[PDB]
Amino acid sequence: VDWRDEPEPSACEQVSWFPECTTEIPDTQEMSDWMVVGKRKMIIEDETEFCGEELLHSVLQCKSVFDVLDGEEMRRARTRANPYEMIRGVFFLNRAAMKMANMDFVFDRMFTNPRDSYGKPLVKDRELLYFADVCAGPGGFSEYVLWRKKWHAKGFGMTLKGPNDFKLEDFYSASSELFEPYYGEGGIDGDGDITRPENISAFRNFVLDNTDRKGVHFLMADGGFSVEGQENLQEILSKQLLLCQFLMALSIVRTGGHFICKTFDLFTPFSVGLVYLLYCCFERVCLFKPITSRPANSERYVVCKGLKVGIDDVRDYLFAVNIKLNQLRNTDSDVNLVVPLEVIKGDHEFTDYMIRSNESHCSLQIKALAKIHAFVQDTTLSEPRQAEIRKECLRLWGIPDQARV
RNA sequence: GAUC
Ligand SMILES: *P(=O)(O)OP(=O)(O)OP(=O)(O)OC[C@H]1O[C@@H](N2CN(C)c3c2nc(N)[nH]c3=O)[C@H](O)[C@@H]1O
Ligand SMILES: C[S@@+](CC[C@H](N)C(=O)[O-])C[C@H]1O[C@@H](n2cnc3c(N)ncnc32)[C@H](O)[C@@H]1O
């Protein structure tokens, strides 16, 4: 693979969206036969329903190169190969916060100043902005929003307890009156597992009780966990986390509200079916990878604007699917479809975009993967432009180049 | 995925 034939690094990013959905929202009746249960599948290599066989195989052999390469020795080449590496978290708690700084700019203040379809803001600067942040420890996403909105925003967060819990005291700004954590059933005493029906309903009730029963203006979800030793099966291993995050959106996001969620590879029809559901439920959806997302990984984001009225059937349906997933844990079964492949493919415009997205992200990732590998086999190579690139990105995004401590 |  020739990685040196990649486009020049740049602060400028382009975005294209899915076509706006014209078909009606699926109801309970229509979806009554949509859930397919079959053998649990831990193989990814043949998932070519929305991606060319060459591209899928190339990005997997490119990942698997590092199966025998030293992990630290690999991340040191990664640090050198990635032109956007030096940005890091600037004065925030992690680099994840700068992803929201990155994307809030690109999507025209969609999150810090949410509008409706007509161009009218949802919140009067001279009212209060409500947001939710799920699967979110230590809290970088909320750190950005709170730092940007001060006391004009109130955030509700749920994440897994443990070493990766929220770190309020480390927020550059914020306080307990700006950001209020809730861990599911039991409240502050829950575990924050978003994949539990109890926690789901509980956090939903909580968010509604504090948003005039309207829900939040937007939701951000950035869920992930270690897939060490079996990295290639990352999409499958986190299939449920993805579903629960899409579901949480349909559960607490107000009408006309927004939603941004981290996904990984989207080769399986299970994942693609989920996006299709978001596409039916929101006024406009796109798949985007910001430059603050490392170019060799399968990380991208799905950005959703304007929640449609009457999405409750889809909400109930997905809550129901999640329950089956909990029931099929440690068994040889699994939910492999949430929307029939014929229905997804029935929409040519959706499918055309979805395929084109998968492929353009594969080719970029392959090069970056090949790039890291080259930076392993040669430690003198480097991007001499990291400093100047970082500088323009902060200028562009309106992030002051000041320091944390 | 975050961190080291
Ligand atoms: P993130 O964990 O999804 O990815 P990250 O930004 O942290 O980059 P990194 O893990 O270091 O590597 C990028 C992609 O390659 C896969 N890896 C990592 N890794 C150590 C490893 C991978 N793949 C195989 N086949 N074998 C390996 O030992 C990551 O999951 C990313 O997709
Ligand atoms: C790396 S973080 C994202 C970073 C975060 N957005 C930030 O800016 O700090 C991913 C989080 O998802 C959480 N997570 C994974 N599985 C979860 C689950 N089933 N329920 C709740 N949180 C989960 C992890 O604990 C982890 O904290």
Short mmCIF file of C-alpha atoms (C1' of nucleotides) and ligand atoms in Angstrom, two decimals:
data_model
loop_
_atom_site.label_atom_id
_atom_site.label_comp_id
_atom_site.label_asym_id
_atom_site.label_seq_id
_atom_site.Cartn_x
_atom_site.Cartn_y
_atom_site.Cartn_z
CA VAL A 1 0.00 0.00 0.00
CA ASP A 2 1.23 3.49 -0.88
CA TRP A 3 0.53 5.72 2.11
CA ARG A 4 2.57 8.63 0.76
CA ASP A 5 -0.14 9.24 -1.86
CA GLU A 6 -2.45 10.54 0.86
CA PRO A 7 -3.85 14.07 0.68
CA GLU A 8 -1.90 16.81 2.44
CA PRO A 9 -2.91 17.35 6.08
CA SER A 10 -5.26 20.30 6.63
CA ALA A 11 -7.52 21.99 9.17
CA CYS A 12 -10.26 22.19 6.54
CA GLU A 13 -12.87 19.43 6.71
CA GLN A 14 -15.81 18.70 4.42
CA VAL A 15 -19.08 17.06 5.44
CA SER A 16 -21.77 15.28 3.43
CA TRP A 17 -25.06 14.04 4.90
CA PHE A 18 -27.45 11.17 4.24
CA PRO A 19 -30.38 12.17 2.01
CA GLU A 20 -33.28 13.37 4.16
CA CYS A 21 -35.61 10.48 4.94
CA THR A 22 -38.96 10.66 3.14
CA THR A 23 -40.50 7.33 4.19
CA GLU A 24 -42.70 7.12 7.30
CA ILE A 25 -41.38 6.13 10.71
CA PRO A 26 -41.71 2.38 11.31
CA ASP A 27 -44.45 1.50 13.81
CA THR A 28 -44.84 -1.47 16.17
CA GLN A 29 -46.82 -3.38 13.55
CA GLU A 30 -44.26 -3.04 10.76
CA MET A 31 -41.26 -3.87 12.98
CA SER A 32 -42.99 -6.91 14.47
CA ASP A 33 -40.98 -9.23 12.21
CA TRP A 34 -37.77 -7.17 11.99
CA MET A 35 -35.75 -8.78 14.80
CA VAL A 36 -33.78 -11.80 13.57
CA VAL A 37 -32.09 -14.16 16.03
CA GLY A 38 -29.40 -16.63 14.95
CA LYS A 39 -26.00 -18.17 15.69
CA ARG A 40 -23.57 -15.88 17.49
CA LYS A 41 -21.04 -14.73 14.89
CA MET A 42 -17.50 -13.79 15.91
CA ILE A 43 -16.17 -13.49 12.36
CA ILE A 44 -15.96 -10.15 10.54
CA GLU A 45 -13.90 -10.92 7.43
CA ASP A 46 -16.85 -11.69 5.13
CA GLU A 47 -19.08 -8.75 6.09
CA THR A 48 -19.11 -7.19 2.63
CA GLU A 49 -22.80 -6.26 2.37
CA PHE A 50 -21.89 -2.55 2.51
CA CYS A 51 -18.20 -2.64 1.63
CA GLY A 52 -16.00 -4.04 -1.14
CA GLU A 53 -14.25 -7.32 -0.33
CA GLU A 54 -10.84 -5.84 -1.22
CA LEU A 55 -11.26 -2.88 1.15
CA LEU A 56 -12.52 -4.89 4.14
CA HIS A 57 -9.74 -7.49 3.85
CA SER A 58 -7.08 -4.83 3.33
CA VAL A 59 -8.00 -2.91 6.50
CA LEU A 60 -8.00 -6.14 8.53
CA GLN A 61 -4.64 -7.42 7.33
CA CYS A 62 -3.43 -3.86 7.98
CA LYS A 63 -4.66 -3.98 11.57
CA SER A 64 -3.33 -7.52 12.07
CA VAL A 65 0.20 -6.42 11.13
CA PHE A 66 0.52 -5.15 14.71
CA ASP A 67 -0.44 -8.54 16.17
CA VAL A 68 3.26 -9.31 16.55
CA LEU A 69 4.48 -5.72 16.85
CA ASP A 70 5.16 -4.23 20.28
CA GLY A 71 2.23 -2.18 21.60
CA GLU A 72 4.27 0.72 22.96
CA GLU A 73 6.62 0.61 20.00
CA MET A 74 3.53 0.90 17.80
CA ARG A 75 1.99 3.85 19.64
CA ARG A 76 5.29 5.73 19.32
CA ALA A 77 5.13 5.49 15.53
CA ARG A 78 1.45 6.44 15.71
CA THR A 79 2.43 9.61 17.59
CA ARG A 80 4.84 10.44 14.76
CA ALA A 81 2.64 9.48 11.80
CA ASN A 82 -0.46 11.41 12.89
CA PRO A 83 -0.26 15.10 11.85
CA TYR A 84 -3.05 16.02 14.29
CA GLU A 85 -1.46 14.29 17.28
CA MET A 86 0.03 17.33 19.01
CA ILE A 87 -3.41 18.87 19.54
CA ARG A 88 -4.16 16.44 22.35
CA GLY A 89 -6.52 17.86 24.96
CA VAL A 90 -4.97 21.33 25.20
CA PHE A 91 -6.28 22.59 28.55
CA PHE A 92 -8.99 19.95 28.97
CA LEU A 93 -8.77 16.64 30.86
CA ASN A 94 -8.33 14.44 27.79
CA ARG A 95 -8.15 14.53 24.00
CA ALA A 96 -11.79 13.46 23.76
CA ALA A 97 -12.87 16.97 24.80
CA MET A 98 -11.09 18.38 21.76
CA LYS A 99 -13.16 16.06 19.55
CA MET A 100 -16.27 17.98 20.65
CA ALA A 101 -14.34 21.23 20.20
CA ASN A 102 -13.48 19.93 16.74
CA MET A 103 -17.02 18.90 15.85
CA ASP A 104 -18.95 21.75 17.47
CA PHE A 105 -17.16 24.06 15.03
CA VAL A 106 -17.61 21.82 11.98
CA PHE A 107 -21.36 21.44 12.57
CA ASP A 108 -21.84 25.18 13.10
CA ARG A 109 -22.35 25.30 16.89
CA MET A 110 -24.96 22.55 16.57
CA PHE A 111 -24.27 21.54 20.17
CA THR A 112 -23.39 24.74 22.03
CA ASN A 113 -26.14 26.65 20.20
CA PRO A 114 -28.74 24.16 18.85
CA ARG A 115 -31.19 25.43 16.24
CA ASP A 116 -34.23 23.85 14.62
CA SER A 117 -34.79 22.95 10.98
CA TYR A 118 -36.00 26.48 10.24
CA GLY A 119 -32.91 28.18 11.65
CA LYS A 120 -34.44 29.17 14.98
CA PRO A 121 -32.44 28.46 18.17
CA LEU A 122 -34.04 26.16 20.74
CA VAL A 123 -32.74 28.16 23.71
CA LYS A 124 -33.00 31.90 24.46
CA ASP A 125 -29.56 33.18 25.51
CA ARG A 126 -30.87 36.21 27.41
CA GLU A 127 -33.63 30.10 29.08
CA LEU A 128 -31.48 27.08 29.96
CA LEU A 129 -29.71 24.59 27.68
CA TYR A 130 -30.22 20.94 28.64
CA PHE A 131 -27.84 18.19 27.53
CA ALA A 132 -27.02 14.59 28.36
CA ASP A 133 -23.65 12.84 28.26
CA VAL A 134 -23.68 9.04 28.30
CA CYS A 135 -20.82 6.51 28.29
CA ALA A 136 -18.65 9.45 29.11
CA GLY A 137 -16.08 9.04 31.91
CA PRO A 138 -13.96 11.03 32.75
CA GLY A 139 -16.17 13.73 31.17
CA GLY A 140 -14.23 15.58 28.47
CA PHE A 141 -17.29 16.03 26.24
CA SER A 142 -19.17 17.73 29.07
CA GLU A 143 -16.05 19.68 30.00
CA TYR A 144 -16.12 21.37 26.60
CA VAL A 145 -19.83 22.18 26.69
CA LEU A 146 -19.85 23.47 30.26
CA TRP A 147 -16.71 25.53 29.66
CA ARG A 148 -18.39 27.02 26.61
CA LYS A 149 -21.88 27.52 28.08
CA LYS A 150 -21.02 28.24 31.74
CA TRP A 151 -24.13 28.50 33.91
CA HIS A 152 -26.44 28.59 30.89
CA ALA A 153 -26.24 24.82 30.50
CA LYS A 154 -27.21 21.90 32.76
CA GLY A 155 -25.89 18.44 31.94
CA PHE A 156 -26.95 14.94 32.95
CA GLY A 157 -24.34 12.19 32.82
CA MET A 158 -24.28 8.41 33.06
CA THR A 159 -21.19 6.20 32.73
CA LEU A 160 -19.68 3.00 34.16
CA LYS A 161 -18.43 3.29 37.75
CA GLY A 162 -14.80 2.33 38.34
CA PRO A 163 -11.42 3.69 37.18
CA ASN A 164 -13.11 5.39 34.21
CA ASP A 165 -15.81 7.17 36.21
CA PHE A 166 -16.60 10.89 35.95
CA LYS A 167 -13.99 13.28 37.28
CA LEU A 168 -15.93 16.43 38.19
CA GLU A 169 -13.17 18.00 40.28
CA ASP A 170 -10.91 17.88 37.21
CA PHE A 171 -13.22 19.91 34.95
CA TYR A 172 -11.53 23.14 33.82
CA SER A 173 -14.77 24.92 34.73
CA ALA A 174 -18.03 23.29 35.87
CA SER A 175 -19.52 22.38 39.26
CA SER A 176 -22.16 20.07 40.76
CA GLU A 177 -24.96 22.47 39.79
CA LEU A 178 -23.88 22.42 36.14
CA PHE A 179 -23.35 18.68 35.77
CA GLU A 180 -25.37 16.09 37.69
CA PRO A 181 -24.33 12.38 37.43
CA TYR A 182 -26.99 9.65 37.73
CA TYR A 183 -26.07 5.97 37.64
CA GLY A 184 -29.32 4.20 36.80
CA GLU A 185 -31.45 2.30 39.30
CA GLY A 186 -30.56 3.50 42.79
CA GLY A 187 -29.56 6.91 41.48
CA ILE A 188 -26.10 7.95 42.68
CA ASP A 189 -25.76 4.35 43.92
CA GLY A 190 -26.24 2.66 40.54
CA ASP A 191 -23.46 1.14 38.43
CA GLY A 192 -24.16 3.29 35.39
CA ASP A 193 -24.33 0.32 33.02
CA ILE A 194 -26.32 1.72 30.10
CA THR A 195 -27.03 -1.80 28.85
CA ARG A 196 -29.35 -2.51 31.79
CA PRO A 197 -33.09 -1.92 31.19
CA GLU A 198 -33.40 -0.73 34.82
CA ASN A 199 -30.71 1.93 34.39
CA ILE A 200 -32.20 2.92 31.05
CA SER A 201 -35.70 3.63 32.39
CA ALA A 202 -34.27 5.25 35.53
CA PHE A 203 -31.94 7.69 33.77
CA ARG A 204 -34.80 8.44 31.38
CA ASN A 205 -37.19 9.29 34.21
CA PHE A 206 -34.46 11.33 35.90
CA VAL A 207 -33.66 13.37 32.77
CA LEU A 208 -37.35 13.99 32.11
CA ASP A 209 -38.02 15.07 35.72
CA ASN A 210 -35.41 17.79 35.26
CA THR A 211 -36.27 19.01 31.77
CA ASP A 212 -39.93 19.98 32.24
CA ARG A 213 -40.70 16.47 30.95
CA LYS A 214 -39.49 17.61 27.51
CA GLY A 215 -36.07 15.92 27.54
CA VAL A 216 -32.64 17.28 26.63
CA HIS A 217 -31.76 19.58 23.72
CA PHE A 218 -29.08 17.14 22.64
CA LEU A 219 -27.35 13.94 23.69
CA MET A 220 -23.73 12.95 23.23
CA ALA A 221 -22.55 9.35 23.54
CA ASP A 222 -18.92 8.23 23.23
CA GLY A 223 -18.94 4.62 24.50
CA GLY A 224 -16.00 2.24 24.23
CA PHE A 225 -13.91 -0.34 26.08
CA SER A 226 -10.80 -2.49 25.65
CA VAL A 227 -10.92 -5.04 22.84
CA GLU A 228 -7.27 -6.04 23.33
CA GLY A 229 -6.28 -9.32 21.68
CA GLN A 230 -9.40 -9.30 19.51
CA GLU A 231 -9.32 -5.81 18.01
CA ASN A 232 -10.67 -6.89 14.62
CA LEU A 233 -13.99 -7.87 16.18
CA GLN A 234 -14.51 -4.48 17.86
CA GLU A 235 -17.78 -3.62 16.09
CA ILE A 236 -19.33 -6.96 17.03
CA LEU A 237 -18.06 -6.91 20.62
CA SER A 238 -19.71 -3.52 21.18
CA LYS A 239 -22.86 -4.13 19.15
CA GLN A 240 -25.06 -3.83 22.28
CA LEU A 241 -23.38 -0.65 23.58
CA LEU A 242 -24.13 0.93 20.22
CA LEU A 243 -27.79 -0.08 20.37
CA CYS A 244 -28.29 1.19 23.91
CA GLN A 245 -26.77 4.55 22.99
CA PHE A 246 -29.02 4.97 19.95
CA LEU A 247 -31.91 3.93 22.18
CA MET A 248 -30.99 6.38 24.91
CA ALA A 249 -31.27 9.12 22.27
CA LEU A 250 -34.81 8.08 21.36
CA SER A 251 -35.57 8.00 25.10
CA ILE A 252 -34.46 11.40 26.44
CA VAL A 253 -33.81 13.67 23.45
CA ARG A 254 -36.62 16.20 23.00
CA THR A 255 -38.42 16.78 19.70
CA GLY A 256 -36.21 18.73 17.31
CA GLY A 257 -33.29 17.73 19.50
CA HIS A 258 -29.86 16.55 18.41
CA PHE A 259 -27.68 13.49 19.02
CA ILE A 260 -24.05 12.62 18.34
CA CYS A 261 -22.69 9.11 18.96
CA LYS A 262 -19.34 7.38 18.48
CA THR A 263 -19.42 4.21 16.43
CA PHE A 264 -16.70 1.96 15.13
CA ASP A 265 -16.66 -0.14 11.97
CA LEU A 266 -20.10 -0.36 10.38
CA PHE A 267 -19.72 -3.44 8.17
CA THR A 268 -22.36 -5.68 9.77
CA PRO A 269 -26.04 -5.26 8.80
CA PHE A 270 -26.85 -5.10 12.51
CA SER A 271 -24.92 -1.83 12.85
CA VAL A 272 -26.16 -0.50 9.51
CA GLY A 273 -29.74 -1.29 10.46
CA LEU A 274 -29.29 0.82 13.59
CA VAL A 275 -28.05 3.81 11.59
CA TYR A 276 -31.04 3.34 9.29
CA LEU A 277 -33.28 3.60 12.35
CA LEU A 278 -31.60 6.86 13.33
CA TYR A 279 -32.02 7.99 9.74
CA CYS A 280 -35.77 7.34 9.95
CA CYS A 281 -36.03 9.07 13.33
CA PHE A 282 -34.06 12.28 12.73
CA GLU A 283 -34.47 14.95 10.07
CA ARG A 284 -30.89 14.55 8.88
CA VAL A 285 -28.04 12.15 9.60
CA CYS A 286 -24.41 11.86 8.56
CA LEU A 287 -21.30 9.79 9.25
CA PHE A 288 -18.26 11.88 10.13
CA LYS A 289 -14.67 11.39 11.26
CA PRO A 290 -13.05 14.53 12.75
CA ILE A 291 -9.29 15.09 12.48
CA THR A 292 -9.12 14.72 16.28
CA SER A 293 -10.07 11.09 15.73
CA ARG A 294 -6.88 9.10 15.09
CA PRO A 295 -6.63 8.29 11.35
CA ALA A 296 -5.64 4.62 11.73
CA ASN A 297 -8.60 3.57 13.90
CA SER A 298 -12.18 2.56 13.10
CA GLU A 299 -13.59 5.44 15.12
CA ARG A 300 -16.12 7.72 13.47
CA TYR A 301 -19.16 9.65 14.66
CA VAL A 302 -22.80 9.65 13.64
CA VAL A 303 -24.35 13.12 13.78
CA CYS A 304 -28.12 13.48 14.03
CA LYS A 305 -30.21 16.66 13.87
CA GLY A 306 -33.89 17.21 14.62
CA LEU A 307 -35.71 14.38 16.35
CA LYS A 308 -39.00 13.58 14.61
CA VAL A 309 -42.37 13.49 16.36
CA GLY A 310 -43.73 9.99 16.93
CA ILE A 311 -40.57 7.93 17.35
CA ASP A 312 -41.99 6.04 20.34
CA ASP A 313 -42.58 2.76 18.52
CA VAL A 314 -38.93 2.60 17.45
CA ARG A 315 -37.99 3.46 21.03
CA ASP A 316 -40.12 0.62 22.40
CA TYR A 317 -38.81 -1.73 19.73
CA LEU A 318 -35.14 -1.06 20.56
CA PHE A 319 -35.77 -1.31 24.31
CA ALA A 320 -37.24 -4.73 23.52
CA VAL A 321 -34.27 -5.79 21.37
CA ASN A 322 -31.79 -4.87 24.10
CA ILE A 323 -33.62 -7.16 26.51
CA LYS A 324 -33.18 -10.17 24.19
CA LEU A 325 -29.46 -9.35 23.96
CA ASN A 326 -29.17 -9.54 27.76
CA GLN A 327 -30.99 -12.89 27.61
CA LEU A 328 -28.67 -14.31 24.95
CA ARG A 329 -25.48 -13.45 26.84
CA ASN A 330 -22.99 -16.34 27.11
CA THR A 331 -25.14 -18.39 24.73
CA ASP A 332 -24.55 -19.46 21.13
CA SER A 333 -27.34 -17.16 19.95
CA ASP A 334 -27.36 -13.43 19.15
CA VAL A 335 -29.53 -10.74 17.57
CA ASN A 336 -28.00 -10.39 14.11
CA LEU A 337 -30.59 -8.15 12.48
CA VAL A 338 -32.69 -5.22 13.70
CA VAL A 339 -33.85 -4.14 10.23
CA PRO A 340 -34.27 -6.59 7.30
CA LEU A 341 -31.49 -6.38 4.70
CA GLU A 342 -34.16 -5.99 2.00
CA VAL A 343 -35.57 -2.85 3.66
CA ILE A 344 -32.14 -1.23 4.05
CA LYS A 345 -31.15 -2.09 0.47
CA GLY A 346 -34.66 -1.12 -0.65
CA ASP A 347 -33.55 2.46 -0.04
CA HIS A 348 -30.98 3.01 -2.77
CA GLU A 349 -30.02 6.51 -1.57
CA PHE A 350 -29.34 5.34 1.98
CA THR A 351 -27.37 2.30 0.80
CA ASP A 352 -25.37 4.35 -1.75
CA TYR A 353 -24.21 6.73 0.98
CA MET A 354 -23.58 3.97 3.52
CA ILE A 355 -21.37 2.01 1.11
CA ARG A 356 -19.51 5.11 -0.04
CA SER A 357 -18.90 6.09 3.59
CA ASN A 358 -17.58 2.64 4.55
CA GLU A 359 -15.23 2.59 1.58
CA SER A 360 -13.78 6.09 1.83
CA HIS A 361 -13.11 5.46 5.53
CA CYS A 362 -11.44 2.13 4.73
CA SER A 363 -9.01 3.58 2.19
CA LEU A 364 -8.04 6.42 4.53
CA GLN A 365 -7.58 4.03 7.45
CA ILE A 366 -5.57 1.56 5.35
CA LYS A 367 -3.07 4.25 4.38
CA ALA A 368 -2.79 5.51 7.97
CA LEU A 369 -2.33 1.91 9.10
CA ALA A 370 0.32 1.33 6.45
CA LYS A 371 1.77 4.67 7.51
CA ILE A 372 2.19 3.65 11.16
CA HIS A 373 3.76 0.36 10.05
CA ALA A 374 6.26 2.32 7.95
CA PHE A 375 7.02 4.54 10.94
CA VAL A 376 7.77 1.40 12.91
CA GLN A 377 10.19 0.00 10.33
CA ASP A 378 11.85 3.43 10.15
CA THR A 379 12.13 5.62 13.24
CA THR A 380 13.70 8.62 11.47
CA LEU A 381 10.51 9.41 9.54
CA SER A 382 8.20 12.11 10.89
CA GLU A 383 5.56 14.72 10.07
CA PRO A 384 7.41 18.06 10.33
CA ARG A 385 4.10 19.92 10.30
CA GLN A 386 2.46 18.79 13.56
CA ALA A 387 3.20 22.06 15.40
CA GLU A 388 1.89 24.36 12.66
CA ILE A 389 -1.20 22.20 12.03
CA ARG A 390 -2.13 22.10 15.70
CA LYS A 391 -1.84 25.88 15.77
CA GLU A 392 -4.29 26.51 12.94
CA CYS A 393 -6.82 24.01 14.29
CA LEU A 394 -7.04 25.82 17.62
CA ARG A 395 -7.29 29.14 15.78
CA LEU A 396 -10.00 27.76 13.53
CA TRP A 397 -12.02 26.17 16.34
CA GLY A 398 -11.72 29.10 18.73
CA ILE A 399 -9.78 27.19 21.38
CA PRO A 400 -7.26 29.33 23.30
CA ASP A 401 -3.75 27.86 23.37
CA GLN A 402 -3.49 28.06 27.17
CA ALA A 403 -2.41 25.33 29.59
CA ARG A 404 -4.21 23.20 32.16
CA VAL A 405 -2.38 23.39 35.50
"C1'" G B 1 -12.46 4.27 23.09
"C1'" A B 2 -9.91 7.39 27.71
"C1'" U B 3 -5.24 7.21 30.22
"C1'" C B 4 -0.34 5.76 31.13
P1 LIG C 1 -9.07 2.82 19.44
O1 LIG C 1 -8.66 1.94 20.56
O2 LIG C 1 -10.34 2.19 18.71
O3 LIG C 1 -7.86 2.95 18.42
P2 LIG C 1 -6.67 3.88 18.77
O4 LIG C 1 -7.01 5.27 18.41
O5 LIG C 1 -6.41 3.78 20.22
O6 LIG C 1 -5.37 3.47 17.94
P3 LIG C 1 -4.73 2.04 18.13
O7 LIG C 1 -5.57 1.25 19.03
O8 LIG C 1 -3.34 2.16 18.75
O9 LIG C 1 -4.62 1.33 16.69
C1 LIG C 1 -5.51 1.68 15.70
C2 LIG C 1 -6.35 0.67 15.14
O10 LIG C 1 -5.65 -0.61 15.10
C3 LIG C 1 -6.29 -1.47 15.98
N1 LIG C 1 -5.31 -2.23 16.75
C4 LIG C 1 -4.61 -1.80 17.81
N2 LIG C 1 -3.80 -2.81 18.24
C5 LIG C 1 -2.89 -2.71 19.38
C6 LIG C 1 -3.98 -3.88 17.44
C7 LIG C 1 -4.95 -3.51 16.49
N3 LIG C 1 -5.36 -4.38 15.54
C8 LIG C 1 -4.84 -5.62 15.49
N4 LIG C 1 -5.30 -6.56 14.46
N5 LIG C 1 -3.91 -6.02 16.38
C9 LIG C 1 -3.46 -5.19 17.36
O11 LIG C 1 -2.49 -5.67 18.27
C10 LIG C 1 -7.12 -0.61 16.86
O12 LIG C 1 -8.23 -1.31 17.36
C11 LIG C 1 -7.53 0.47 15.98
O13 LIG C 1 -8.62 0.10 15.18
C1 LIG C 2 -13.19 6.36 26.57
S1 LIG C 2 -14.72 6.86 27.16
C2 LIG C 2 -15.22 8.35 26.23
C3 LIG C 2 -14.63 9.65 26.68
C4 LIG C 2 -15.58 10.70 27.14
N1 LIG C 2 -16.48 11.05 26.05
C5 LIG C 2 -14.82 11.89 27.58
O1 LIG C 2 -14.83 12.95 26.85
O2 LIG C 2 -14.18 11.87 28.62
C6 LIG C 2 -15.88 5.55 26.93
C7 LIG C 2 -16.70 5.25 28.15
O3 LIG C 2 -17.75 4.34 27.83
C8 LIG C 2 -17.99 3.73 29.08
N2 LIG C 2 -18.75 2.59 28.94
C9 LIG C 2 -18.42 1.44 28.29
N3 LIG C 2 -19.43 0.57 28.42
C10 LIG C 2 -20.41 1.14 29.15
C11 LIG C 2 -21.68 0.72 29.60
N4 LIG C 2 -22.18 -0.62 29.28
N5 LIG C 2 -22.41 1.57 30.33
C12 LIG C 2 -21.96 2.81 30.65
N6 LIG C 2 -20.75 3.25 30.23
C13 LIG C 2 -19.97 2.44 29.49
C14 LIG C 2 -16.67 3.41 29.54
O4 LIG C 2 -16.64 3.19 30.89
C15 LIG C 2 -15.90 4.62 29.16
O5 LIG C 2 -15.78 5.47 30.26
#
